[PDB]
Amino acid sequence: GPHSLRYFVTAVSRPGLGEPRYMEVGYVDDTEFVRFDSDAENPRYEPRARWMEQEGPEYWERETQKAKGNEQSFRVDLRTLLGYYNQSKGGSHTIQVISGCEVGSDGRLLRGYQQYAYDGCDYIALNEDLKTWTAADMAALITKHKWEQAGEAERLRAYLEGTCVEWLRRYLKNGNATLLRTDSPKAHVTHHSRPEDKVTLRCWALGFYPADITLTWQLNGEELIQDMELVETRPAGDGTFQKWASVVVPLGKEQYYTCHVYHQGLPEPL
């Protein structure tokens, strides 16, 4: 199937004591692979996953460099929006962004992106016909008529279909059988009196990767819902995950119920 190469970025205004924070982490698929974070001794853009750690100083250095170039670039952006909105320099302000390209089911480009959101809420987006942008708010319109002006729309096309791809595959090769290799779950149920009319039973899906699964209680045919309590899915230290779902079953009439866990590294019928 296909793949990601998204870059999620955060810059926060820390007004009073502290200069703006800068964080960029590049994810691969869901496999987290690079970071930068202005709150480190050596404000570094160094590894994650052993595989990135099998590269050298022209990827590190130019790209540590490249990031720092962004730190300052933003920290100017923060002052600007602040202006746009006519905000008082006082509290924190948050600038986020997700960037990237999805490789089609054959090794080229089936997707391309560019989001900006200021203080949780959409600000700018690049709309797919990688040329039109959309101004979310009243003041995203402002960059529109400039960002479009110069070549910051057209010059992107290239990053995406180009570099973002060209580059992207090196990664999807050096940490090949790493970025995948499913994790078979282990399950059980745990009956619990709640009480004497009924007995809550509960399903244990725990020990998996990828992050997804879909559990179910099937009362012999009918797939049960309204009796269903769902935990939504959550990571468990180890980087295993876990999930569970439950039902309020008539004390006595317990056995008549079926527990169902389905996940891609599990060959599980019914």
Binding site: Y7, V9, W147, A150, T163, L168
Partner: peptide, 8 residues
């Protein structure tokens, strides 16, 4: 790779 974002 990384991008050199600017403008705003």
């Amino acid at each position: 790779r990384g991008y050199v974002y600017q403008g705003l």
